Amino acid sequence: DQLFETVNKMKDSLQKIHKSLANFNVKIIERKNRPMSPDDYDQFLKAIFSNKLTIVKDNGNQIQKLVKEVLDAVKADKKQNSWKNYNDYVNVIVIEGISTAIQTALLHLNEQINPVFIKRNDISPLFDIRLELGQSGIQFDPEIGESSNQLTVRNTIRNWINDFFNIAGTIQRLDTTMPGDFLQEIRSFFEIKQCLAMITQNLEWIENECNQFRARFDTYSYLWTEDEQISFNRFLD
Known part of the structure; x- marks a missing residue:
């Protein structure tokens, strides 16, 4: 019985560790019906991200115990x-x-993020883009580019990707080191790299065709804003 009860406790512990990990990944991103705004998605998403991050930490504490x-x-x-x-x-x-939980959240974003799946479905638009005429060129509120300054869809999406990576802190390793990181190990996984690489390719595809759509307006409208009013005299002679 002593041998049997000890074996069951060891088996029960391993089983409990596996069950906790599956529930914690969930859905990384939830779509609230109709479109709002870039900043708004970060605002609506931030409340969901905090609850998801806390739940992952709670599961991690139970696994550690x-x-x-x-x-x-x-x-x-x-x-x-x-x-x-x-x-x-x-x-x-x-x-x-x-890695599996983070991969599922990234995969869920890919179905929404990638256009071909979106075109087949009736979901259509999710994000909202604002266009304001700019003297230097047509300028989007999102600005369609990595940018590395202010706020952009790539910068936001980049922030979204970081949240899955952030779940690394909650685990706090397994044993031997009191303080340990988990992003280096998760980043090393080949499967995680393929999902992250696929997301970047989808973002680049919309920017290209998007530039062509923005170029049609730019062929005449952008050229007009650039020209000075005093150009009327040149037209006469």
Whole structure:
């Protein structure tokens, strides 16, 4: 019974660790029906992101406590190598689970972010873009580009991608190091890189065709704004 109960506790702990990881990934992004605004999505998304981040941390705390229970059930010294090898294995499963959860959230964004899936569906538009005439050129409120300054769709999407990466802090490693990062391990995964790479390709595709659509207005309207009024005299002779 002592041997049996200890084995069940070890099996129960591993099973509990796996179940917690699956529930925590959820949906990374939720679409609230009709379009609002870029800043607005960050505003509406920020409330959802905080709740999702807190839930992931709560699941992580339970998994960390579950690991402590195994040592009590096993009654094996931490110094012994056998426990150390097992300790790394639990951490690896959590890492693998985090990669799958982050991958699902990124994949959900890809279906919304990629145009071909969107064209087939009746979902159509999600984000909202504002166009204001600019003397230097036609300028969008989003500005369609990486930019690296002020606010842009790529900068926001870039912030969105960081939130999945941010879930790394909640895990706080598995054992041996009190303070540990999880972004380096998740970034290393080949599967995570492919999903991230796919998202970047979709963003570039809309910008190209989008530039062509903006170019048609730019062929005559942009040229007009640039020319000075005193150009009327030149037209006469």
